Amino acid sequence: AAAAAANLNAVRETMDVLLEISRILNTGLDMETLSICVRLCEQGINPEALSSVIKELRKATEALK
Amino acid sequence: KSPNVLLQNLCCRILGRSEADVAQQFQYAVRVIGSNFAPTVERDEFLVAEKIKKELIRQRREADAALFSELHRKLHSQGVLKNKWSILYLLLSLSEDPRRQPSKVSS
Amino acid sequence: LIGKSINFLHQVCHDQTPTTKTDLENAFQGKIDAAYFETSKYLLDVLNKKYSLLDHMQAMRRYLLLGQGDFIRHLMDLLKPELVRPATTLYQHNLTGILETAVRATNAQFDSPEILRRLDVRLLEVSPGDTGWDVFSLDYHVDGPIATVFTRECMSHYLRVFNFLWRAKRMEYILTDIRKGHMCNAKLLRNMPEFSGVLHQCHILASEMVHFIHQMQYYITFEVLECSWDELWNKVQQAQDLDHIIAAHEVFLDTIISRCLLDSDSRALLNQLRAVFDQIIELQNAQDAIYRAALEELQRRLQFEEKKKEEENKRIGEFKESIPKMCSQLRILTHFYQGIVQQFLVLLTTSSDESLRFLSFRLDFNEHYKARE
């Protein structure tokens, strides 16, 4: 169809603008980790939870590995 | 996908470790996500947009503070998302100091 | 302007006074000129005296353009340890509270009460990773009918200027900290002459930075903060309508922000100045590491000799190999610095060069620069 590929376009655009937003705010998250986090917040989830987890998981490979 | 196994996929992207090598990291993910399982937080994305613009003025790059404004408009312009607030709150909270940002490609 | 001025005098300033009273056989002109002079001058008389516009513009320079000196040095001397720690622990009320007693301790307590109530600490925001030096500007709010003269948009540009000079005074007293380390440590380093070479190596990079910075201070002193102030003072004494005050004071602002490196084209020069701002605090870590290592052996050697009243020959082995590695580290630091400062002067090329020539003139002397040393 047309509106089914325009729906597939409307995520691909937003994932590209959020990729600019990710580097200008200087996170350690790349595009691959970003895609999981955008699926989680597509369902709806506390970002306050996700922030504390990633502050620990990133701290779980620079002093435990 | 179910969210519980999605946490373990996240743990194998962030850390190079497999999902059968450790279970403690996944257990901490279950510890925080569980008993917070449903969304209960409130969004005020207006205030957080106004707080990103003050930060981009603080870099003393003022052309890029208004380029973000037009890129922030586009997320509402498409509007296929759940909350615009959530991923932006996550991405603001994890900030490090680029000291003033010695470059930006601007797409 | 006439009807607007008399309305403004009544409604905001809260003074009720009727003072005032071929085209049409030229009927308009005489009463219009008279009314012009009388109403606008009376309005300026009540703003200059009663709401003290005169002291307020004087203290605008003193606080937002950092043109007092006493206040800032006192401020930084007491407020180093809090501000160096990140803004996640900083809380604005502590800074405001320490400031008032600090002003009473030094000489800024003989000031008029008006300027003492306008000042308060202004935070920007708390975001992780920033040092507290990054989010610190004085507010210096202003209210009244004078608020129409001094806009918020004025203060915004002032805060940017504040940020530049605030760096250029923090870093300057960090250079003074470098010099303090040199002077008050070499006076007890008269035990051993083995240090003299690498000590000279530290001293020369200190002196190289002093020649830049102390000149740069003089440049800001006499050609950014004095010429504009002279022009501003004369444009204030010349005023006979309030629009003259506004449309001259904005030129005062718009020439400070162009004499300082905050334009669209001068951003690259500021960027390279940031490298100098990096190397000065890097030299702070270079110096203390030498002292904290060198001094330790001498104390334990004194205690080893008091035991006897070949073990300390093995400390000489680590010393004799650590002096080249430390020396070469400082050498590549100096080479980095040399390349950057000569690139700074050689980047200066003609596209307006109306204040960058004037800084280079004073920075370049003995013609050691562009003689290739």
Numbering used by the authors:
A (entry chain k): 11 to 75
B (entry chain j): 7 to 113
C (entry chain F): 485 to 505, 524 to 811, 827 to 890
What does the report in the manuscript say about this coordinate set?
The gamma-tubulin ring complex (γ-TuRC) is the principal microtubule nucleation template in vertebrates. Microtubules are formed de novo in a process termed nucleation, which is spatially and temporally highly controlled by γ-tubulin complexes, composed of γ-tubulin1 and associated γ-tubulin-complex proteins (GCP). In most eukaryotes, microtubules are templated from a preassembled γ-tubulin ring complex (γ-TuRC) that determines the position and direction of microtubule growth.
In the next step of complex assembly, a second γ-TuSC unit is recruited to the GCP2(5)-facing side of the assembly intermediate, occupying positions 3 and 4 of the fully assembled γ-TuRC. Interestingly, during this step of complex assembly, the GRIP2 domains of the γ-TuSC(5,6) unit are repositioned by ~5 Å towards the helical axis of the γ-TuRC and become locked in their final position.
